[PDB]
Structure 1
Amino acid sequence: GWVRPDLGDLSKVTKVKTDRPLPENPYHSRARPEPNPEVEGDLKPARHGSRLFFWTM
């Protein structure tokens, strides 16, 4: 009763039932480093300007 699969059939992506649980950390990665604290808030003009030597702006 075997029917030869048609052109293109064996290259299909199929779905399989399995009881093996999905691996949680397949790469065995360490915990990632914490990101640097975000800079937030409203942008305000610089206090007394550039403050470069004698410049007042």
Structure 2
Amino acid sequence: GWVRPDLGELSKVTKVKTDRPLPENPYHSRARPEPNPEVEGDLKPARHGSRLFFWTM
């Protein structure tokens, strides 16, 4: 009573019902480094300008 698969069937992506748990960390990665802080705030003008030796703007 076995039926041979048609052209296209054995390459289908099928879904599998399992009882084992999903691997939560399969790469065994350690804790990632904390990122650098983002920039926040409103952008104020430069305090007394460029501060390049005598340039007052």
How does the TM-score come out when normalised to structure 1? Answer: 0.97
More helix by share: 1
Q: Give the paired residue count.
A: 57
Structure 1 ranges of 4+ moved more than 3 A: none
Provide structure 1 residue ranges, at least 5 long, that are not aligned to the other structure. Answer: none
Between the aligned residues of both structures, percent identity stands at: 98
SS in structure 2 at match of 1:11:
coil
TM-score by length of 2: 0.97
Measured against aligned partners, the alpha-carbon deviations of 1:17-44 in whole angstroms (never above 9, x if no partner) come to: 0001000100000000000111100011
Separation in 2 of the partners of 1:2 and 1:39? 66
What CA distance in whole angstroms lies between the structure 2 residues aligned with 1:45 and 1:4? 76
Q: CA deviation at 1:4?
A: 0.4
Alignment root-mean-square deviation, CA: 0.5
